[PDB]
């Protein structure tokens, strides 16, 4: 626990930070993106949020499109199973 090992063991599926508008999407219907690559940028409040790839696998589908409203904690990028 001192070496921060438990800090690494944390993972979760992509989700919308809050309810707001999706300004643009960096992930197409089928694309290969490494983890950390931006998927979409969302502006629900005064700030702006960029979504990073939770995993390096190819994106299966894009649930939302630009100008759409995304509910809180809702999936945006579907990742193909590996």
């Amino acid at each position: 626990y001192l070496s921060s090992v438990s800090s690494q063991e944390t993972q979760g599926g992509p989700l919308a930070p809050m309810t707001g508008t999706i300004e643009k999407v960096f992930v197409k219907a089928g694309d290969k993106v490494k983890a950390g690559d931006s998927l979409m940028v969302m502006i629900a409040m005064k700030m702006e949020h960029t979504i990073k790839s939770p995993k390096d696998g190819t994106v299966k589908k894009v649930f939302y499109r630009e100008g759409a409203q995304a509910n809180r904690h809702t999936p945006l990028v579907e990742f193909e199973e590996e």
Partner: peptide, 9 residues
């Protein structure tokens, strides 16, 4: 930057 606003919220 403010308080979260929404019908569900």
């Amino acid at each position: 930057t403010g308080f979260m606003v929404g019908r569900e919220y």
